[PDB]
């Protein structure tokens, strides 16, 4: 038995498992299946620990997973989950500037608004100081959570834009090896 070629086969399978778990994480996020999202995140994170070298495509995959994990934890490092999602975003999917900026600005506004929604206005100002203007600071100071600014840059709008991005990732990975072979087995029966 060759311990080098056996290790190589394990790295190939890990790559296959990573793409399959990214696809599964994307559907759970799209469908709002929270428990399924948490279980798939736990499996992807464990599989990622078995990888020590990643290709450019594999790095994009894990960073999309990390991004969706922080977005899902948004209303729950020393910064908040949405501020952390903001850092991952920017280093990923920058090539499509128009849709990238929309999601970026929606996350920026919502990282403050979720703190206001939770009644933690001191944290809302701390997030504002770290991200960033005089009118947004007035809104926070006045606890004006339902200001028309927050209704255009809303949570639902942030989720809709992110969900449309997840649909592009979902279509790009729908034909990866592990999911394609699995779907074939299901359709063969049936």
Q: Does 26 bind ligand UUG (CB under 6 A)?
A: no
Q: 160 CB contacts (<8 Å, ≥6 apart)?
A: none
Residues β-bridged to residue 89: 92
Tell me how far apart the alpha carbons of residues 98 and 103 are, in angstroms, rounded to a whole number: 9
From the list 28, 106, 112, 139, which residue makes contact with ligand UUG (rule: CB under 6 A)?
28
Nearer to ligand UUG, 76 or 188 (CB): 76
Q: Does 103 bind ligand UUG (CB under 6 A)?
A: no
Task: From 69, 139, 132, select the one nearest 77 (Cα to Cα).
Answer: 69
Tell me how far apart the alpha carbons of residues 111 and 71 are, in angstroms, rounded to a whole number: 10
Tell me how far apart the alpha carbons of residues 51 and 58 are, in angstroms, rounded to a whole number: 10
Q: Does 41 bind ligand UUG (CB under 6 A)?
A: yes
Nearer to ligand UUG, 3 or 185 (CB): 3
The minimum distance between CB 181 and a copy of itself, in angstroms, equals 8
Q: Does 119 bind ligand UUG (CB under 6 A)?
A: no
**Residues that bind ligand UUG in the complex, under the rule CB under 6 A:** 28-29, 32-34, 37, 41, 44-45, 48, 62, 65-66, 69, 72, 74-75, 159
């Amino acid at each position: 038995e060759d311990a080098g070629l056996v290790a190589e086969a394990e790295a190939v399978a890990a790559g296959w498992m990573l793409d399959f778990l990214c696809l599964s994480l994307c559907r759970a996020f799209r469908d709002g299946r929270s428990e399924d999202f948490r279980r798939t995140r736990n499996s992807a994170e464990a599989i990622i620990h078995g990888l020590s070298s990643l290709t450019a495509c594999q790095l994009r995959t894990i960073y999309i997973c990390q991004f969706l994990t922080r977005i899902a934890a948004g209303k729950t490092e020393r910064i908040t989950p949405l501020e952390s999602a903001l850092m991952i975003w920017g280093s990923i999917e920058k090539e499509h500037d128009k849709l990238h900026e929309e999601i970026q600005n929606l996350i920026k506004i919502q990282a403050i608004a979720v703190c206001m929604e939770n009644g933690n206005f001191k944290e809302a100002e701390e997030v504002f100081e770290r991200i960033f203007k005089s009118k947004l600071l007035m809104i926070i100071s006045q606890k004006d959570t339902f200001h028309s600014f927050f209704q255009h840059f809303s949570y639902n709008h942030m989720m809709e834009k992110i969900k449309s991005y997840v649909n592009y990732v979902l279509s790009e990975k729908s034909s990866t090896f592990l999911m394609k072979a699995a779907a074939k087995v299901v359709e063969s029966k049936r």
